[PDB]
Design an enzyme around this catalytic site. Structure first.
Site, PDB file in Angstrom:
ATOM      1  N   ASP A 135      27.946 -82.953 -21.318  1.00 60.76           N
ATOM      2  CA  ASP A 135      27.573 -81.959 -21.493  1.00 60.76           C
ATOM      3  C   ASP A 135      27.722 -81.579 -22.964  1.00 60.76           C
ATOM      4  OD1 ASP A 135      30.368 -82.045 -22.622  1.00 60.76           O
ATOM      5  OD2 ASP A 135      30.943 -82.044 -20.939  1.00 60.76           O
ATOM      6  N   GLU A 174      27.602 -88.637 -41.117  1.00 60.86           N
ATOM      7  CA  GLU A 174      26.888 -87.203 -41.804  1.00 60.86           C
ATOM      8  C   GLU A 174      27.797 -85.770 -41.562  1.00 60.86           C
ATOM      9  OE1 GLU A 174      22.606 -85.016 -41.097  1.00 60.86           O
ATOM     10  OE2 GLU A 174      23.306 -86.054 -40.388  1.00 60.86           O
ATOM     11  N   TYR A 175      28.036 -85.021 -43.359  1.00 61.79           N
ATOM     12  CA  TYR A 175      28.595 -84.854 -42.898  1.00 61.79           C
ATOM     13  C   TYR A 175      27.808 -83.501 -43.160  1.00 61.79           C
ATOM     14  CZ  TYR A 175      30.676 -80.851 -46.611  1.00 61.79           C
ATOM     15  OH  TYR A 175      30.963 -79.422 -46.936  1.00 61.79           O
ATOM     16  N   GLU A 203      31.475 -76.402 -29.553  1.00 59.30           N
ATOM     17  CA  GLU A 203      32.299 -77.126 -30.322  1.00 59.30           C
ATOM     18  C   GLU A 203      31.657 -79.196 -31.027  1.00 59.30           C
ATOM     19  OE1 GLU A 203      32.776 -74.497 -27.343  1.00 59.30           O
ATOM     20  OE2 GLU A 203      31.959 -76.572 -27.108  1.00 59.30           O
ATOM     21  N   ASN A 204      31.264 -79.202 -30.131  1.00 60.14           N
ATOM     22  CA  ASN A 204      29.750 -80.316 -30.223  1.00 60.14           C
ATOM     23  C   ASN A 204      28.478 -79.943 -31.081  1.00 60.14           C
ATOM     24  OD1 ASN A 204      32.181 -81.772 -28.196  1.00 60.14           O
ATOM     25  ND2 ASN A 204      30.108 -81.922 -26.406  1.00 60.14           N
TER      26      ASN A 204
HETATM   27  N1  ADP Z   1      29.737 -84.965 -39.247  1.00 58.37           N
HETATM   28  C1  ADP Z   1      31.181 -83.336 -39.955  1.00 58.37           C
HETATM   29  N2  ADP Z   1      30.852 -82.709 -40.645  1.00 58.37           N
HETATM   30  C2  ADP Z   1      31.451 -81.480 -41.175  1.00 58.37           C
HETATM   31  N3  ADP Z   1      32.588 -80.868 -40.571  1.00 58.37           N
HETATM   32  C3  ADP Z   1      32.965 -81.798 -39.190  1.00 58.37           C
HETATM   33  C4  ADP Z   1      32.251 -82.869 -39.113  1.00 58.37           C
HETATM   34  N4  ADP Z   1      32.856 -83.694 -37.431  1.00 58.37           N
HETATM   35  C5  ADP Z   1      33.796 -83.328 -37.596  1.00 58.37           C
HETATM   36  N5  ADP Z   1      33.917 -82.169 -38.723  1.00 58.37           N
HETATM   37  C6  ADP Z   1      34.605 -80.798 -38.318  1.00 58.37           C
HETATM   38  O1  ADP Z   1      35.972 -81.665 -37.934  1.00 58.37           O
HETATM   39  C7  ADP Z   1      36.544 -80.426 -36.134  1.00 58.37           C
HETATM   40  C8  ADP Z   1      37.138 -81.469 -35.516  1.00 58.37           C
HETATM   41  O2  ADP Z   1      36.633 -82.985 -35.332  1.00 58.37           O
HETATM   42  P1  ADP Z   1      36.336 -83.473 -34.305  1.00 58.37           P
HETATM   43  O3  ADP Z   1      37.636 -84.611 -33.896  1.00 58.37           O
HETATM   44  O4  ADP Z   1      34.600 -83.370 -34.078  1.00 58.37           O
HETATM   45  O5  ADP Z   1      36.827 -82.245 -32.750  1.00 58.37           O
HETATM   46  P2  ADP Z   1      36.864 -83.397 -31.673  1.00 58.37           P
HETATM   47  O6  ADP Z   1      37.453 -84.968 -31.434  1.00 58.37           O
HETATM   48  O7  ADP Z   1      38.012 -82.355 -30.816  1.00 58.37           O
HETATM   49  O8  ADP Z   1      35.259 -82.716 -31.126  1.00 58.37           O
HETATM   50  C9  ADP Z   1      35.096 -80.125 -35.471  1.00 58.37           C
HETATM   51  O9  ADP Z   1      35.328 -78.639 -35.521  1.00 58.37           O
HETATM   52  C10 ADP Z   1      34.462 -79.638 -37.332  1.00 58.37           C
HETATM   53  O10 ADP Z   1      34.765 -78.560 -38.154  1.00 58.37           O
HETATM   54  N1  ADP Z   2      30.088 -84.115 -55.526  1.00 53.34           N
HETATM   55  C1  ADP Z   2      29.993 -83.855 -54.889  1.00 53.34           C
HETATM   56  N2  ADP Z   2      31.323 -83.212 -54.164  1.00 53.34           N
HETATM   57  C2  ADP Z   2      31.480 -82.548 -53.029  1.00 53.34           C
HETATM   58  N3  ADP Z   2      30.729 -82.567 -52.110  1.00 53.34           N
HETATM   59  C3  ADP Z   2      28.734 -82.199 -52.283  1.00 53.34           C
HETATM   60  C4  ADP Z   2      28.320 -83.080 -53.629  1.00 53.34           C
HETATM   61  N4  ADP Z   2      27.740 -83.266 -54.335  1.00 53.34           N
HETATM   62  C5  ADP Z   2      27.110 -82.487 -52.756  1.00 53.34           C
HETATM   63  N5  ADP Z   2      27.975 -82.146 -52.288  1.00 53.34           N
HETATM   64  C6  ADP Z   2      27.358 -81.226 -51.296  1.00 53.34           C
HETATM   65  O1  ADP Z   2      27.402 -82.303 -50.062  1.00 53.34           O
HETATM   66  C7  ADP Z   2      26.632 -80.912 -49.139  1.00 53.34           C
HETATM   67  C8  ADP Z   2      25.284 -81.890 -49.047  1.00 53.34           C
HETATM   68  O2  ADP Z   2      24.606 -82.396 -50.194  1.00 53.34           O
HETATM   69  P1  ADP Z   2      22.805 -82.186 -50.840  1.00 53.34           P
HETATM   70  O3  ADP Z   2      22.298 -82.542 -49.614  1.00 53.34           O
HETATM   71  O4  ADP Z   2      23.052 -82.702 -52.260  1.00 53.34           O
HETATM   72  O5  ADP Z   2      23.143 -80.870 -50.904  1.00 53.34           O
HETATM   73  P2  ADP Z   2      20.951 -80.081 -50.175  1.00 53.34           P
HETATM   74  O6  ADP Z   2      20.971 -80.887 -48.514  1.00 53.34           O
HETATM   75  O7  ADP Z   2      22.117 -78.556 -49.641  1.00 53.34           O
HETATM   76  O8  ADP Z   2      20.403 -80.077 -51.045  1.00 53.34           O
HETATM   77  C9  ADP Z   2      26.032 -79.921 -49.647  1.00 53.34           C
HETATM   78  O9  ADP Z   2      26.967 -78.963 -48.827  1.00 53.34           O
HETATM   79  C10 ADP Z   2      26.695 -80.025 -51.106  1.00 53.34           C
HETATM   80  O10 ADP Z   2      26.918 -78.833 -51.980  1.00 53.34           O
END
Ligand code: ADP
Ligand code: ADP
Ligand code: ADP
EC number: 2.7.11.1
Length: 241
Positions: A130, A85-86, A134-135
């Site tokens: 924990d 999940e982003y 950061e997590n």
């Molecule tokens: N699902 C996610 N969406 C957006 N950013 C992420 C996501 N997962 C990781 N990142 C970005 O990557 C950075 C470091 O990644 P991560 O591998 O989770 O760190 P670590 O393995 O050291 O805990 C985070 O600080 C975050 O900004």
């Molecule tokens: N085609 C795309 N390319 C890159 N980023 C995108 C695209 N479509 C959506 N996003 C980004 O991914 C995130 C989640 O998208 P979406 O679930 O549609 O937005 P929201 O949850 O705010 O309605 C948002 O930050 C959005 O701007």
């Protein structure tokens, strides 16, 4: 049947211990997601490839608004790819740096969301070790998402479900004050402070917040609240969205 060519890779979202995280769109269904790339060399090194398979299995089967979803995964000779999940607003940690401390409303809200996630976890017999800022990632609408030096966030007993409540108390304090409650110059000092539950409050911490943190930071686990008592705490309900 996932493979790298299934994705259009975009800008790096951040670098982690074992690789990079990338913004990525699925060519097929056009899903937006975070592609987390781990290097097996570096995982085998740190000896973490074991715990990784475990942690991956469990995280696959959690479904909750405040827990970051793991949609799938795959690998090749050299690396492991996690389809996550982003979370578009970054980490709580970096938001703590941008801001310097959180206000009560923001703090109460995160804790609320955190307590629901953990309540849900406890309902599935899953326990965290924990929860550090950061997590924690932030969703598109500012919603908290559990993603999962380290000393600072460990209960005296790790140094039971009740660990997750010490975690809440550490976070609640950090959110309000801007530093962890047991922060000290060396490992040994920090060990003592956590071990004896030695914290003090700066003047701006209100009576309600002090009361909640104190109930959570109890040396003995059995005396820590139930997650439900946290959710219904007068200070929480007074300040939570
Ligand atoms: N699902 C996610 N969406 C957006 N950013 C992420 C996501 N997962 C990781 N990142 C970005 O990557 C950075 C470091 O990644 P991560 O591998 O989770 O760190 P670590 O393995 O050291 O805990 C985070 O600080 C975050 O900004
Ligand atoms: N085609 C795309 N390319 C890159 N980023 C995108 C695209 N479509 C959506 N996003 C980004 O991914 C995130 C989640 O998208 P979406 O679930 O549609 O937005 P929201 O949850 O705010 O309605 C948002 O930050 C959005 O701007
Ligand atoms: N925003 C997303 N980005 C990337 N993959 C997704 C997204 N939403 C769902 N998926 C994928 O779709 C599959 C199932 O869809 P999903 O809606 O998550 O399950 P369900 O419909 O059973 O709740 C998952 O295996 C996951 O890989």
């Amino acid at each position: 049947q996932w493979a790298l060519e299934d994705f259009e890779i975009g800008r790096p979202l951040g670098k982690g211990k074992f690789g990079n995280v990338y913004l990525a769109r699925e060519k097929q269904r056009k899903f937006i997601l975070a592609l987390k790339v781990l290097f097996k060399a570096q995982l085998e090194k740190a000896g973490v490839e074991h715990q990784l398979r475990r942690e991956v299995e469990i995280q696959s089967h959690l479904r909750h608004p405040n827990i970051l979803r793991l949609y799938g995964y795959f690998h090749d000779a050299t690396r492991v790819y996690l389809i996550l999940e982003y979370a578009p607003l970054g980490t709580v940690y970096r938001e703590l740096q941008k801001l310097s401390k959180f206000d009560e409303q923001r703090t109460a809200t995160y804790i609320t969301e955190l307590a629901n996630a953990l309540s849900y976890c406890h309902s599935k017999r899953v326990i965290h070790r924990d929860i550090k800022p950061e997590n924690l990632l932030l969703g598109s609408a500012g919603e908290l998402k559990i993603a999962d030096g380290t000393l600072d966030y460990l209960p005296p007993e790790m140094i039971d479900e009740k660990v997750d409540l010490w975690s809440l108390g550490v976070l609640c304090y950090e959110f309000l004050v801007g530093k962890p409650p047991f922060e000290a110059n060396t490992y040994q000092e920090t060990y003592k402070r956590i071990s004896r539950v030695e914290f003090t409050f700066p003047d701006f911490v209100t009576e309600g917040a002090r009361d909640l943190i104190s109930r959570l930071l109890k040396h003995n686990p059995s005396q820590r609240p139930m997650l439900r008592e946290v959710l219904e705490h007068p200070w929480i309900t007074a300040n939570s969205s």
